[PDB]
Specification:
Chain A: Residues 3-52 form a coiled coil. This is part of a larger assembly, with chains A (54 residues), B (55 residues) and C (427 residues). Chain A has helices at 6-14, 18-22, 24-27, 43-53. Chain A is mainly α and 54 residues long. Chain B is an all-alpha fold and 55 residues long. Chain B contains 3 helices and no strands. The longest helix of chain B is centred in the C-terminal third of the chain and has 14 residues, at 31-44. Chain C has 427 residues and is an alpha+beta fold. In chain C, 26% of the residues lie in helices and 16% in strands. Chain C has a 7-stranded mixed beta sheet. Chain C has a 6-stranded antiparallel beta sheet with strand order 9-12-13-14-15-16, with no helix packed on it. In chain C, strands 1-2 form a two-stranded antiparallel sheet. In chain C, strand 14 and strand 15 form a beta hairpin. Classes of the chains: A mainly alpha (54), B mainly alpha (55), C alpha+beta (427). The interface between A and B is medium-sized, with 27 and 25 residues.
Amino acid sequence: QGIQQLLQAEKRAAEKVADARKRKARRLKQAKEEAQMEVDQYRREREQEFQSKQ
Amino acid sequence: LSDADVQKQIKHMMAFIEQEANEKAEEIDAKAEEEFNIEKGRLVQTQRLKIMEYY
Amino acid sequence: FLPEEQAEIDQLFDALSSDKNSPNVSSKSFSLKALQNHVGEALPPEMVTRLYDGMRRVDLTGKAKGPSENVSQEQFTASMSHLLKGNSEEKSLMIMKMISATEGPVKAREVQKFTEDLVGSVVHVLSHRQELRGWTGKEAPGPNPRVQVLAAQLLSDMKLQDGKRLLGPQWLDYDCDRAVIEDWVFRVPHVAIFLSVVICKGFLVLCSSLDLTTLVPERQVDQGRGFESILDVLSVMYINAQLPREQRHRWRLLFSSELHGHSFSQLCGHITHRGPCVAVLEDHDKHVFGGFASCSWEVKPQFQGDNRCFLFSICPSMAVYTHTGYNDHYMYLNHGQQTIPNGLGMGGQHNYFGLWVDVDFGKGHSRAKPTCTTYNSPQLSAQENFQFDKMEVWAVGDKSILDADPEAQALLEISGHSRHSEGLREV
């Protein structure tokens, strides 16, 4: 039917945002570890400071 | 003749305006990537000003 | 045609076919030597030849193998019946039958050459007819770089039938038939507008029901100050297209860095409370960008503005980014606080704007790294944090504290505190 099957299109509708909020709660701590990969950018100044000392 | 009119009307909402609740859903993924870059800036611009000032 | 217009369309052909320098011709027809005569210096040479070979390949009867060698009134009135009043199935017909001497789909490399053959000529007819209204954007010796980057913007709406846009060096070799150019003249209004000013301004048909007040705005600067702008005339004919229609006629000067100092306190004093205005600035790497504010600028911490504010781009590329409604963080203006940022900002959020001008004037950022949030707009500048020297704020459409209180200057002198400046300030 229609009103027997409209919520069957709405449960699939509401189950597309819960993965959009679970990916949003992941993307915060997804690359905060790669926001510690700027402590790999500290290397290129240190060997360069070892290069100005060289 | 009668079912050919009621098969169109169950496409009025099912894939046309209920599909846009799925289109309004996956553009919080444009809003969550902007928050991710704030913390990516907020942790670089508090430490890259520190671990480069040492050198 | 109306008989007001049917009068002066034959009054152009009757004076043409009576040429004296071309000898083997009759009274009913002209030849191509006199069509490059009355235009004079109002059109470039690369278009007056296409003025010939776009009108000559009309088929009127239906039997001939191609174009006729003498253009008659039947072959003239029908082509303005295709262009000046015709429909989309008729309009791009005289686009494609101007390109190749053979019929067929015209290739995607040589529609680009025609697109840079048209927009270099609208600035030739409008300057020779003296309708610039002050907007004389200086031509570069060599090619004008704003003719080039404007012409490829129109070809971005060129939707081939595949659904995939023109990308990479395979963008030159598309068999673009009448199937695919006929929505392009439907989607892009300016390729329909610019043909009505290259033809109907040198030919001087005064009965034309166009509007030239709303195509090119009027530059209103105060006199006495020799002032050149950042934006030349093809750029101010680009930004003027995406404004509301009600405001497109007059662009008044509000702030400019080479006349009113290089200060943010002058910027915030000249553009506050002056209605909707277009801020446009150019950094060190020749990247012109900016944005438009829909309401007045007002100094307050809150995010002000509504959905008509947009960001654009001119000199790297020409594109316009309207609102997306994810957030209403539209405009921003703060003037000397310490917990929230001090400057001008549009898009994004606090410290993550899509366009930001700081109080330490000549600096800013467009930190929309993937895109922006309010405007779906990219990183505008070349770097992440640019530096600029020229800024303009243009409105669209339409004493001091030292002399304020005479009791406080009486109490300051009584309390022992000096003046530090007599004979240094005026009165």
